[PDB]
């Protein structure tokens, strides 16, 4: 339960928040994490949960810590410490300067140039899944769209057969929202056990897929190793398999209960990109951290070398000191402030792919199924972790209110 309070941690800064099962979860994950920003909670607190660690609660500190890699290393970015110690994905577990060379190579397989070329492909799949669900008048959004849409896109880019999805998704889920069946260490080992032969055969007979590019790539002039390639593909796998999936559910859950907001984008489709950004702020869902490289006094608090600090990317945009009425969705919001795709040298490499997947979804879905709602009685459940998600999302609609395009 509660790890004994270290001697250096002030008793009054203790706030036992449990990132894997927050107290106010029933009200929605974002709302549950938002408790850390209530009137009497400090900018920086210590929780004795999950082994004990700090938690920056305001955007100001969060952005600062992410900028200062020398004090806040990505060496151990996962909580609990055991997971963080086993975590060695590239470039995520590295700090500049060494991080850069790998980021450049990763950026080459999921970067903008690659995204633009994938546009038509993305639209075709979006249109396909929706046009098929349309006459049915109902769907289980998580498995009928949220998962297949972005996952099939990722497997395509990676050159991996879709039959492996159930196994891979389960492993990634265990790394973000473990059900207890296995440690982060175990899930990582299994992911690597899966990648090894594939990488080997790709360096051997090089193709045009993401895996082949990484496996046969160069890092600042020199050949990447088999192990480095494995570590990088793990970073790409974790990213394009769990995050967009869940975010689409948070956004659709909201749209399903917001006819006014839907009407907005229906009438003025050009507001979709901006709406996408506001949704990214309001339904931010990622929260990982850093490890102190040395004793350091941060905002009046004595942090110790080895201490772990959670810097919830989610909280920045929900901070009222960054956005007035943060919990309100406003597609017209003048200054959408957030760190949803991270902050600093680790800014999400898949953000461009993610935005495209989000916008295309909204545009292609509202254009075919403009009127829809959440199936009655359904108590929509959220789940918290490194990456928060939506358990299930039953939607319903009158086929007569739809249109084929």
# chain residues binding ligand HEM, by CB under 6 A: 26
> For ligand HEM, what does the binding mask look like between residues 90 and 129, x meaning CB under 6 A?
-xx----------x--x---x-------------------
Residue 364, judged by CB atoms within 10 A of its CB (0-12, 13-18, 19+), counts as buried
From 240, 350, 385, 389, active-site residue: 350
Taking the C-alpha atoms of residue 192 and residue 198, their distance in angstroms, rounded to an integer, is: 10
Closest to ligand 5CL by CB, 232 vs 303, is 232
Q: How far is the CB of 270 from ligand 5CL (least distance, A)?
A: 28
Closest to ligand 5CL by CB, 237 vs 362, is 237
Is the Cβ–Cβ distance between 308 and 53 less than 8 Å? yes
Q: Which of 288, 307, 357, 364 binds ligand 5CL (CB under 6 A)?
A: 288
Rounded to whole angstroms, what are the CA distances from 35 to 39, 70, 163, 327? 9, 30, 41, 12
Which residues in the 74-113 window bind K ion by CB under 5 A? 87
Closest to ligand HEM by CB, 13 vs 94, is 94
Which residues in the 270-299 window bind ligand HEM by CB under 6 A? 286, 288
Q: How far is the CB of 54 from ligand 5CL (least distance, A)?
A: 18
Residue of this chain nearest to K ion (CB atom): 87
Q: How far is the CB of 341 from ligand HEM (least distance, A)?
A: 5
Instruction: Select from 140-148, 187-195, 239-247, 264-272 the region that touches ligand HEM (CB under 6 A).
Output: 239-247
Q: Confirm or reject binding of residue 386 to ligand 5CL (CB under 6 A).
A: yes
From 5, 25, 156, 348, active-site residue: 348
Which residues in the 56-95 window bind ligand 5CL by CB under 6 A? 89, 92
Q: How far is the CB of 313 from ligand HEM (least distance, A)?
A: 4
Closest to ligand HEM by CB, 118 vs 129, is 118
Q: Which of 296, 257, 302, 255 is nearest to 276 (CA)?
A: 255
Rounded to whole angstroms, what are the CA distances from 116 to 110, 122, 159, 353, 365? 10, 10, 18, 9, 20
Dmax (CA) of the chain: 65
Per the annotation, the verdict on 177 as an active-site residue is yes
Q: How far is the CB of 386 from ligand 5CL (least distance, A)?
A: 6
Binding partner at 106 among ligand HEM, K ion, ligand 5CL, none, C-beta below 5 to 8 Å by kind = ligand HEM
Return the structure tokens found at 223: 């050949």
Q: Is the dihedral of CA 236, 178, 254, 316 positive or negative?
A: negative
Taking the C-alpha atoms of residue 168 and residue 164, their distance in angstroms, rounded to an integer, is: 6
Per the annotation, the verdict on 348 as an active-site residue is yes
Q: Which of 187, 272, 387, 393 binds ligand 5CL (CB under 6 A)?
A: 387
Binding partner at 110 among ligand 5CL, K ion, ligand HEM, none, C-beta below 5 to 8 Å by kind = ligand HEM
> How many other CB atoms are found less than 10 A from the CB of residue 268?
12
Q: Confirm or reject binding of residue 28 to ligand HEM (CB under 6 A).
A: no
Taking the C-alpha atoms of residue 125 and residue 152, their distance in angstroms, rounded to an integer, is: 9
- Residue 76 in marked binding region: no
Q: Confirm or reject binding of residue 151 to ligand HEM (CB under 6 A).
A: no
Q: Which of 57, 99, 243, 351 binds ligand 5CL (CB under 6 A)?
A: 243
Contacts with K ion by CB under 5 A lie at 87
Please give the annotated binding residues for heme, written as ranges.
348
For the annotated catalytic residues, the residue numbers are 177, 242-243, 348-350
Give the footprint of ligand HEM on this chain (CB under 6 A): 74, 77, 91-92, 103, 106, 110, 235-236, 239-240, 243-244, 247, 286, 288, 313, 340-342, 346, 348-350, 353-354
Give the residue numbers of the binding site.
348
Residues that bind ligand 5CL (CB under 6 A): 89, 92, 235, 238-239, 243, 286, 288, 386-387
């Amino acid at each position: 339960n509660l790890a004994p309070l270290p001697p250096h941690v002030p008793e009054h800064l203790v706030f036992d928040f449990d990132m894997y099962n927050p107290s106010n979860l029933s009200a929605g994950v974002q709302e549950a994490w938002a408790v850390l920003q209530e009137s009497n909670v400090p900018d920086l607190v210590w929780t004795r949960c999950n082994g004990g660690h700090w938690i920056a609660t305001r955007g100001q500190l969060i952005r600062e810590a992410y900028e200062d890699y020398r004090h806040f290393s990505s060496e151990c970015p996962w909580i609990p410490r055991e997971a963080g110690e086993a975590f060695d994905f590239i470039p995520t577990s590295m700090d500049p300067p060494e991080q850069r060379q790998f980021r450049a190579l990763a950026n080459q397989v999921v970067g903008m140039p690659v995204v633009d070329k994938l546009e038509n492909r993305i639209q075709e799949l979006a249109c396909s899944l929706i046009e098929s669900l349309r006459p049915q008048g109902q769907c289980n959004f998580t498995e009928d769209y949220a998962e297949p849409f972005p996952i099939r896109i990722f497997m395509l880019l990676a050159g991996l057969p879709e039959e492996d999805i159930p196994h891979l998704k389960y492993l990634t889920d265990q790394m973000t929202r473990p059900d207890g069946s296995m440690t982060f260490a175990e899930a990582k080992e299994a992911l690597y056990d899966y990648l090894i032969p594939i990488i080997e055969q790709r360096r051997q007979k090089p193709g045009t897929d993401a895996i082949s590019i990484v496996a046969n790539g160069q890092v600042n002039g020199r050949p990447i190793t088999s192990d480095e390639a494995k570590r990088m593909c793990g970073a790409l796998l974790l990213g394009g398999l769990d995050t967009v999936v869940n975010f689409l559910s948070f956004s659709m859950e909201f749209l399903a209960k917001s006819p006014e907001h839907r009407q907005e984008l229906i009438e003025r489709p050009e507001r979709i990109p901006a709406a996408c950004e506001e949704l990214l702020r309001r339904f931010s869902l990622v929260a990982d951290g850093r490890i102190l490289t040395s004793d350091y006094e941060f905002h009046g608090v004595q942090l110790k070398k080895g201490d772990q600090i959670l810097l919830p990317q989610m909280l920045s945009g929900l901070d009222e000191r960054e956005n007035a009425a943060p919990m309100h969705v406003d597609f017209s919001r003048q200054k959408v402030s957030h760190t949803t795709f991270g902050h600093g040298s680790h800014l999400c490499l898949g953000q461009h792919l993610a935005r495209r997947e989000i916008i295309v979804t909204l545009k292609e879905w509202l254009t075919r199924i403009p009127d829809f709602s959440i199936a009655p009685g359904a108590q929509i459940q959220h789940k918290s972790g490194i990456v928060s998600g939506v358990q299930a999302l039953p939607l319903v609609w009158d086929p007569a209110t739809t249109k084929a395009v």
